[PDB]
Amino acid sequence: TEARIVFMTTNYIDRLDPALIRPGRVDLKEYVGYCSHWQLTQMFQRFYPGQAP
Amino acid sequence: ARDRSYAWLLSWLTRHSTRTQHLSVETSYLQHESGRISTKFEFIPSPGNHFIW
After folding, report:
1. Which residues of chain A make contact with B36, given a CB cutoff of 8 A?
2. Contacting residues for B24 by C-beta, under 8 A, at least 6 apart
3. B30, B37, B39: which to substitute to probe chain A, counting the most A Cβ within 10 Å?
4. 3-state per-residue secondary structure call for B1-53
5. What residues contact residue A19 under an 8 Å CB cut-off, 6+ apart?
């Protein structure tokens, strides 16, 4: 059925058969990895509002 | 109900029911030509004795 959005998540992308994730069954694959410097800065600023950067 | 004639006759009764006031509801999704899908309320004559001309 058209007009449908599907979200799929996994922790081992290597375990997904390539036919399952192809451009037209999954249009966008994004890697959400560990923290980065900017990510840590943003998390610290959001958890402790008001402190100096 | 074991024949496709039952489905065809039920559909024809739902369409040609004149102003029958003993209907029952039936919910479905209709895909508009615009591309999106909205709820469709279709009325089928509820069980009972109905008269046609």
Report:
1. 3
2. B43, B44, B45, B46, B47
3. B37
4. CCCHHHHHHHHHHHHCCCCCCCEEEEEEEEECCCCCEEEEEEEEECCCCCCCC
5. none
